[PDB]
């Protein structure tokens, strides 16, 4: 009964952390910056995912006695978490790149509606990548396993296509945007006497960029291994490397551990935000 205890502990820790972050952020409403709104949406996604942990805690001891709509919602939330995180991080990185390099501000002089509608757009575009998860993921009942685990029903031919779509889009595209934007930020920031036209704004911009880059590094480090495992599964399905049972019993536990890391990131984010951002705790308590 180690897994239910661990799931409950993570549920409590993540709930407390993300609730505190969201409460302190919404306390000073109608005065947030673009990065503050993006981090608020990341916190919303993280708390929305960690809100499903007690269901898996119950499933770890007793079978999945929950129905099918709950299963669909849980799978959709798990996928939406790592879709929205990557896309919102790419948006914030592009904003930082523009501000550092071209000295142009989109979300500052423009209305807050400019960032509100891009947040709505990324939310909708993430829902429209998890619609296939809604179409599938019913609760089954297999032989030799007297349980109702959550699995997929659609044909194996479609599994490869969906996996390729998820991997390609939600890993390659944000990764390319990240690499380009951050390479240019580092090039234009390691050799400049004074960003903008003053010094206080220079150091403020440096601090904000440092916070953004540490958040991005944490997210990438937590979520990359799962995508590597999915890539390995995709290649072994096509025929590049063999489907030996000794190569399947290992990718199963690899998937389990990497999904656990993806779940732990949702509670790792707020304490990282508070420790590095000491000023955040100053305005919190």
């Amino acid at each position, epitope marked *: 009964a180690f897994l239910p205890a661990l799931y409950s502990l993570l549920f409590l820790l993540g709930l407390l952390g993300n609730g505190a972050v969201a409460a302190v952020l919404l306390s000073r409403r109608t005065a947030l910056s673009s990065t503050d709104t993006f981090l608020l949406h990341l916190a919303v996604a993280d708390t929305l995912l960690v809100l499903t942990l007690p269901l898996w805690a119950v499933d770890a001891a007793v079978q999945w006695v929950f129905g099918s709509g709950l299963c669909k919602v849980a799978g959709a939330l798990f996928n939406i978490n790592f879709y929205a995180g990557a896309l919102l991080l790419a948006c914030i990185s592009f904003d930082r790149y523009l501000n550092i390099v071209h000295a142009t501000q989109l979300y500052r002089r423009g209305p807050p509606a400019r960032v509100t509608l891009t947040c709505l757009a990324v939310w909708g575009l993430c829902l429209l990548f998890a619609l296939p998860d809604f179409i599938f993921l019913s609760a089954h009942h297999d032989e030799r396993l007297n349980a109702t685990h959550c699995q997929y029903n659609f044909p194996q031919v479609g599994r490869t296509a969906l996996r390729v779509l998820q991997l390609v889009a939600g890993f390659l595209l944000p990764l390319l945007v990240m690499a380009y934007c951050y390479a240019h930020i580092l090039a234009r920031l*390691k050799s400049v*006497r*004074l960003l903008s036209g003053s010094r206080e704004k*220079d*150091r403020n911009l440096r*601090r904000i960029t440092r916070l953004v880059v540490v958040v991005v590094v944490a997210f990438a480090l937590c979520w990359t291994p799962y995508h590597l495992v999915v890539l390995v599964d995709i290649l072994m399905d096509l025929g590049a490397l063999a489907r030996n049972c000794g190569r399947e019993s290992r990718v199963d536990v690899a998937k389990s551990v990497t999904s656990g890391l993806g779940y732990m990131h949702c509670c790792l984010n707020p304490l990282l935000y508070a420790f590095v951002g000491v000023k955040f705790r100053e305005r919190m308590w």
Partner: nanobody
Amino acid sequence: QVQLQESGLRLSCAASGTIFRLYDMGWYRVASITSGGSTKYGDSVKGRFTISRDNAKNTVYLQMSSLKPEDTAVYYCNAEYRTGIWEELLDGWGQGTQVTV
């Protein structure tokens, strides 16, 4: 922090410590050379002095010729530097030098 030690008729100012980059240098009592090599002087100086920079050793020099009694003063070296890539640009002064004729 970092230090800035001067010398004694040639003025050589050096910097040492944990510096990510040096940006500006000069002498005060009038002459300032940037990191790119551009040199600036006062509007009343018609090329009497000359300033050169050696970025490899992080040293700034000041060459003075045709000295006059009106130049007898105390001269301090100044430098701008950043201690890290994420840090703030800040400047430090030197102890100073005394010219006795």
